[PDB]
Amino acid sequence: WGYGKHNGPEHWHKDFPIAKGERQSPVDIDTHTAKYDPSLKPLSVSYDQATSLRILNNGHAFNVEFDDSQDKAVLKGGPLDGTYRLIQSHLHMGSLDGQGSEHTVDKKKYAAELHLVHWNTKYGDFGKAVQQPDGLAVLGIFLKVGSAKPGLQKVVDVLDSIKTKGKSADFTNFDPRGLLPESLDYWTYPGSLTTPPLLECVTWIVLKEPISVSSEQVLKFRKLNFNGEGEPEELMVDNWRPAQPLKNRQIKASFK
Ligand SMILES: [Zn+2]
Structure with a gap:
């Protein structure tokens, strides 16, 4: 699989039927419908002890692997229940400045x-x-x-x-x-x-x-x-x- 005409996003569903699922990503974030959620707790990003190990090219995107053998860098709060450990990072890049992101905000890329x-x-x-x-x-x-x-x-x-x-x-x-x-x-x-x-x-x-x-x-x-x-x-x-069907999911905002 890839991003070419013959192995791109429109072909993924054949090997991975979930591609046509109910909660697929990315999505376009429509600020006119997104809703502020007061029940969200403060977001906590603890990366002061973060420890990266290497950068890699897996043929799909630039990647970074982190040491996740312990709670060195974790994400908590917000909509999250519990502790989430950082394991990797990757970059989605466009060929022109006007494109490249997966999520969009009011259609903006x-x-x-x-x-x-x-x-x-x-x-x-x-x-x-x-x-x-x-x-x-x-x-x-x-x-x-x-x-x-x-x-x-x-x-x-x-x-x-x-x-x-x-x-x-x-x-x-x-x-x-x-x-x-x-x-x-x-x-x-x-x-x-x-x-x-x-x-x-x-x-x-x-x-x-x-x-x-x-x-x-x-x-x-x-x-x-x-x-x-x-x-x-x-x-x-x-x-x-590209942006996938929202399927009536609710996008919540952390701000008013
Ligand atoms: Zn990604």
């Missing part, structure tokens, strides 16, 4: 969207968590082109080391705190993974405020390859799934 994946520790490990409706908590962060982002420059400098699929590079200083916007205002709704297996095990927390990255940083990420070494080049761009 951002240049890219970062996902920070966490699993509910009541389940023992990621593998078991992904099989439960409340197994994962994914924080979505929109990226727009503008001022460069320092917390991303160190990664951008070594992207050439993971240009093709199957490549990985040790990276112990990827601090997720440096990818967060100033405000933690967010929208939340029950959804799924946006790539096969497309399991509907995700509580989505999409931040309202995008972060800025420079055109140069964006360009570097767009130079990654979908293909493996020695294969015809296929730039890793537009690796995003």
